[PDB]
Amino acid sequence: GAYKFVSELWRRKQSDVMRFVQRVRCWEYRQQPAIVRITRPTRPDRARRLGFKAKQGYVVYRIRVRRGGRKRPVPKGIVYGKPKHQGITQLKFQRNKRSVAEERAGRRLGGLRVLNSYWVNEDSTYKYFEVILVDVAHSAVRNDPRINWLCKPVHKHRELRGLTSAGKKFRGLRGKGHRHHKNRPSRRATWKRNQTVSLRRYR
Amino acid sequence: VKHNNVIPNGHFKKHWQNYVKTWFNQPARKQRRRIARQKKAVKIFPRPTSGPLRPIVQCQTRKYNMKARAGRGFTLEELKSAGIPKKLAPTIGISVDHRRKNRSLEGMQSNIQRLKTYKAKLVIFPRRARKVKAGDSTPEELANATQVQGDYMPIARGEKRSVEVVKVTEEMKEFKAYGKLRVERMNQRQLGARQKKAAEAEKEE
Amino acid sequence: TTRFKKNRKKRGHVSAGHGRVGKHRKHPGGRGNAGGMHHHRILFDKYHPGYFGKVGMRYFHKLSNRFYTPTVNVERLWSMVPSDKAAEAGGDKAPVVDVSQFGYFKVLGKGMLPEKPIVVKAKLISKIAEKKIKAAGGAVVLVA
Amino acid sequence: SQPKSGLFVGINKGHVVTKRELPPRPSDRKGKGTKRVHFVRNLIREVAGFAPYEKRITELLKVGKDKRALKVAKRKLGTHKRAKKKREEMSSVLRKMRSA
Amino acid sequence: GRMFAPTRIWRKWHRRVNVRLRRVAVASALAATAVPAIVTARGHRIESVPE
RNA sequence: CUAGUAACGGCGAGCGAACCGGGAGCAGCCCAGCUUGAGAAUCGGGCGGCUGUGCCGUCCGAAUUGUAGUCUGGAGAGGCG
RNA sequence: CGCCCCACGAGGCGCCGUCAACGAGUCGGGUUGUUUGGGAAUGCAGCCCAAAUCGGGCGGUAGACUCCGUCCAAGGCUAAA
RNA sequence: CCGACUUUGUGAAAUGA
Ligand SMILES: [Mg+2]
Ligand SMILES: [Mg+2]
Ligand SMILES: [Mg+2]
Ligand SMILES: [Mg+2]
Ligand SMILES: [Mg+2]
Ligand SMILES: [Mg+2]
Ligand SMILES: [Mg+2]
Ligand SMILES: [Mg+2]
Ligand SMILES: [Mg+2]
Ligand SMILES: [Mg+2]
Ligand SMILES: [Mg+2]
Ligand SMILES: [Mg+2]
Ligand SMILES: [Mg+2]
Ligand SMILES: [Mg+2]
Ligand SMILES: [Mg+2]
Ligand SMILES: [Mg+2]
């Protein structure tokens, strides 16, 4: 039982052991390309719990993403409108950077399907997410009873559409009661359902 | 606006004509659902068409607490005390609901009574032809089973209106029920101050 | 029914019934309740006194179930008693009625009662209702 | 607990129905600390060390200023409920270090 | 161009009548047939019908 | 249906859901973890054979930074019947 | 309708009391923008703060305490309507 | 333009506690 030991070791993220081993990795990462194939998870126990396996076809990609919000890309900062949509620089994006990393890897890696992603490193400029992807064509993945669900055609570009673990968080689906009822089935499906003027036959 | 009228409140400022929902497919909905039910019945011949069994439960919510209705499944405690295993109740057409809680013997015994009646009037075909194992039923019993239709156990929604006639005792007449009703409203209002005054007796006294 | 619509009778009269001098333009008074405090003021303060302003304290997440108390006056109770169990009675024996079996919670007290004793059994009652029932000789049982 | 009063208003109001005592369920022990996980967390506590706010709380307790220790623990952790119990755990870790 | 106020599918194609008023109407439809004079006045050829 | 209601709003114009209840349909599941260590029991690819959506024999390889197996909180692991 | 007969392995049921592990820059907090009916802040997002295991989230007014009811997140799949 | 937090580590003295 090593994964529990390494789990608390990675829980104590302000201890000096993680401060060291994590700053040196931050340098190494900052010196490599944005999207890079890594042959082993750096956080094997985090990957286990999110469905990584030491089995062929599960690949791990380190995607570097930048930090900070979204500044409105207009011709100078000149927004034609009323004073209430006339701001530029304090707006925040509506997808977490974890999902942005998954959806960068989704565009780079055409043939493979994103499964999950987990935080590994960060600094003032960047965050680093290690994204578990699956090759849906190799026989070792086609013959696993537990992960066929990803080879059915309704699962193309999950991350491009909001269906992974990080996707649901920004979709508002971590939550069940009120406080989260408008986000099921989706906020736009709720909006349509609530706007339909139902005119019955014998109204 | 103009002459005395109720103040207008039409919610017709968005693009509502893009979302008008007209119901002209309503009869076809009915016919489609009917065909769906008919073919489900044909596939599940000779299981009852009502599907699996359900519990008598009370509704929530003061408005409806006094009205019984159908539930989602018998709790593990009923399924255990009826001799009907957890894993096997959905197999023999009894729902199971792991989430409910039983707080009253009355509810628990009522749902046991439904389980016992169902197990009395349930017939189960053998998994194979000649091999009749435990829980099955006799060939001559099986030969007369049909597809029971509709609600083969109706749940009476509320207790029947009986208005009987009894003595008017003087120990009944003397009871001041309005004063009673006001006194415990006092008890509820004062429960704060009374327990404060009490607790300070321990603190100081 | 188009054949009854009075516009069909205004065919041939140039103005279609909205005047020559002052015409029928689009919205000469604003869209809807506009000008409540400005020019429709006379209207809103003559025919709708009390429209403008805040009164009373907010109640977050009101559930209408918690405010639910269907009432019955005393005058209605004997209708609840079928004739044959009205006859199965004497001077001293009275029918026992549980109103909750009828869907009422409170038993208010408007109206007459006969001399006949009646034993109502309710979840709430008022002053006057019990006074009328006792004065009729019947009694009260509180339940829930 | 004991049944309702049976009268529609008042302290413990409602309808009398005979109450039943619910046998324990899993997730009634949810989070009951266990021998091995206490082992695991102990060991990595010692191997990793203390965070800087944890060390500052140790210092405020080894001086004895428990109000300030709570105050900084709150400003870090976020809520009174967690701040008080992080202070409680650092008092534990400091008594168990002065014990020898 | 268009037509003025183009017709829309959400006109009131179906109308409702009280169920008891349908029952009243069908009873008074029956009650009128039992009359040879109104069956005739409605246009049917009834001159050899026995009763 | 709740409900143009609670709410929200230069509390102005306006905006506006939810629990309860009635119906339609109803179905639950599987992983990571402590748990083969007398023994990787797992998977893939090449080649060959057949009964060909696969199965078998052999070689190479992946995998001990853990594949498979038990377990998923309603439990469960054990011992007993 | 016929030939093949299902076990010492798994499950169920009952007894036990000893175990009984449950997902981390994740929740939570501050602040900022947007969003909402969500109002001392409904969601979401950035930044900074940054966890717990007699423990965590809720009970629609911010707060401390006592009790109560409730559920167990941060991994995944799932027809019908 | 400016301050604070952040990437941001290592150790030395002088004044303040
Ligand atoms: Mg614009
Ligand atoms: Mg428009
Ligand atoms: Mg004229
Ligand atoms: Mg003319
Ligand atoms: Mg006119
Ligand atoms: Mg004109
Ligand atoms: Mg003139
Ligand atoms: Mg005019
Ligand atoms: Mg003029
Ligand atoms: Mg003016
Ligand atoms: Mg045309
Ligand atoms: Mg209404
Ligand atoms: Mg937006
Ligand atoms: Mg907000
Ligand atoms: Mg804000
Ligand atoms: Mg899904």
Three-state secondary structure along C16-80? Answer: CCCCCCCCCCCCCCCCCCCCCCCCCHHHHHHCCCCCCCCCCCCCCCCCCCCCCCCEECHHHHHHH
Quote the tokens at residue B180: 């009673």
Return the amino acid letter for A72: R
Give the nucleotide nearest to A67 (CA→C1').
G46
In sign, the C-alpha dihedral spanning B68, B74, B80, B83 is: positive
Are B100 and B71 spatial neighbours (Cβ–Cβ below 8 Å)?
yes
Residue B174 burial (10 A CB sphere; 0-12, 13-18, 19+) = exposed
**Sheet strand arrangement including A126-134:** A35-38, A58-66, A126-134, A113-122
Quote the tokens at residue A201: 């036959």
Instruction: Using the structure block, give the residue that is written with the tokens 């011949």.
Output: B45
Question: How far: A12 CA to G51 C1' (Å)?
Answer: 10
Phi, psi of C52 (to 5 degrees): -90, 125
Report cis status (omega within 30 of 0) of the bond before A185.
Answer: yes
Quick one: three-class SS letters along B191-204? HHHHHHHHHHHHHC
Quote the tokens at residue B58: 């009370």
In sign, the C-alpha dihedral spanning C30, C35, C41, C46 is: positive
Composition of chain B by helix, strand, coil, percent to 5: 40, 10, 55
Quote the tokens at residue B139: 């060939």
Query: What distance in Å separates the CA atoms of residue B7 and residue D91, rounded to the nearest whole number?
Result: 66
DSSP assignment, residue B52? S
Phi, psi of A150 (to 5 degrees): -85, -10
β-pairing, C119-122 with C93-98? parallel
CA angle centred on B31, ends B30 and B36, rounded to 5° = 100
β-pairing, C139-142 with C119-122? parallel
Going by beta carbons, is chain D in contact with chain A, meaning 3 or more pairs sit under 8 Å apart?
yes
CA angle centred on D3, ends C142 and D5, rounded to 5° = 25
- Residues of B (18-47) whose Cβ lies below 8 Å from E: 20, 22, 24
Nucleotide G55: closest residue by CA–C1': D31
Query: What distance in Å separates the CA atoms of residue B23 and residue B28, rounded to the nearest whole number?
Result: 10
Q: What is the largest CA-CA distance in chain B?
A: 86
Specify the length of chain B in residues: 205
Give B23 Cα–ligand 11 centroid separation in angstroms: 27
Composition of chain D by helix, strand, coil, percent to 5: 55, 0, 40
* Cross-chain residue pair B166–C141, CB shorter than 8 Å: no
Report cis status (omega within 30 of 0) of the bond before B46.
Answer: yes
Give the nucleotide nearest to D40 (CA→C1').
G21
Question: How far: A50 CA to F30 C1' (Å)?
Answer: 13
Q: Which residues pair with A65 in a beta bridge?
A: A127
- Contacts of residues A65-74 at CB distance under 8 Å and 24 or more positions apart, as own/partner, are A65/A97, A65/A100, A65/A101, A65/A104, A65/A126, A65/A127, A65/A128, A65/A129, A66/A125, A66/A126, A66/A127, A67/A97, A67/A122, A67/A124, A67/A125, A67/A126, A67/A127, A69/A93
From the list C69, C78, C70, C71, the residue with the least C-alpha distance to C133 is C78
* Cross-chain residue pair D9–B181, CB shorter than 8 Å: yes
From the list B49, B42, B43, the residue with the least C-alpha distance to B152 is B49
From the list B90, B78, B108, B101, the residue with the least C-alpha distance to D25 is B101
* Residues in Cβ contact with B96 at an 8 Å cutoff, skipping those fewer than 6 apart: B73, B74, B76, B79, B86, B89, B90
Query: What distance in Å separates the CA atoms of residue A87 and residue D67, rounded to the nearest whole number?
Result: 43
Residue B177 burial (10 A CB sphere; 0-12, 13-18, 19+) = buried
Specify the length of chain D in residues: 100
CA C5 to chain centre: 35
Quote the tokens at residue A178: 């009120």
β-pairing, B20-22 with A197-199? parallel
Query: What distance in Å separates the CA atoms of residue C118 and residue A199, rounded to the nearest whole number?
Result: 50
Nucleotide G46: closest residue by CA–C1': A69
Quote the tokens at residue A135: 């090759």
Phi, psi of C102 (to 5 degrees): -100, -15
Quote the tokens at residue A167: 């996707």
Query: What distance in Å separates the CA atoms of residue B83 and residue B111, rounded to the nearest whole number?
Result: 13
- Contacts of residues D59-67 at CB distance under 8 Å and 24 or more positions apart, as own/partner, are D61/D87, D61/D90, D61/D91, D61/D94, D62/D94, D66/D91
From the list B108, B109, B79, B110, the residue with the least C-alpha distance to B95 is B79
Query: What distance in Å separates the CA atoms of residue B40 and residue B55, rounded to the nearest whole number?
Result: 23
Quote the tokens at residue E5: 């106020």
Q: Which DSSP helix (H) or strand (E) runs through B22?
A: strand B20-22
Return the amino acid letter for B11: H
A26 touches strand H (CB under 7 A): yes
Cα Rg for chain B, rounded, in angstroms? 29
Question: How far: B132 CA to H17 C1' (Å)?
Answer: 91
Instruction: Using the structure block, give the residue that is written with the tokens 């029920």.
Output: B177
Technique used by the depositors = cryo-EM
Chains contacting A (3+ CB pairs below 8 angstroms): B, D, E
DSSP assignment, residue E11? S
Give the nucleotide nearest to A6 (CA→C1').
F65
DSSP assignment, residue B115? H
From the list A30, A28, A60, the residue with the least C-alpha distance to A44 is A60
Quick one: three-class SS letters along A30-95? HCCCCEEEECCCCCHHHHHHCCCCCCCCEEEEEEEEECCCCCCCCCCCCCCCCHHHCCCCCCCCCC
* Residue C66 contacts B where some CB pair is shorter than 8 Å: yes
Q: Which residue of B has its CA nearest to A193?
A: B19
Phi, psi of B176 (to 5 degrees): -90, 90
List of chain B residues whose C-beta atoms are within 8 Å of the C-beta of residue C127: 178
Region for A77 from its dihedrals, namely left if φ exceeds 0, alpha if ψ lies in -120 to 50, beta otherwise? left
C68 touches strand F (CB under 7 A): no
Q: What is the resolution of this structure in A?
A: 3.4
* Residues in Cβ contact with B148 at an 8 Å cutoff, skipping those fewer than 6 apart: B48, B49, B50
Are A141 and A61 spatial neighbours (Cβ–Cβ below 8 Å)?
no
Query: What distance in Å separates the CA atoms of residue D14 and residue D5, rounded to the nearest whole number?
Result: 6
Query: What distance in Å separates the CA atoms of residue C144 and residue D43, rounded to the nearest whole number?
Result: 59
Specify the length of chain C in residues: 144
Query: What distance in Å separates the CA atoms of residue A193 and residue B23, rounded to the nearest whole number?
Result: 15
Query: What distance in Å separates the CA atoms of residue B73 and residue B83, rounded to the nearest whole number?
Result: 16
* Cross-chain residue pair A199–B22, CB shorter than 8 Å: yes
Query: What distance in Å separates the CA atoms of residue B135 and residue C106, rounded to the nearest whole number?
Result: 52
Query: What distance in Å separates the CA atoms of residue A37 and residue A63, rounded to the nearest whole number?
Result: 9
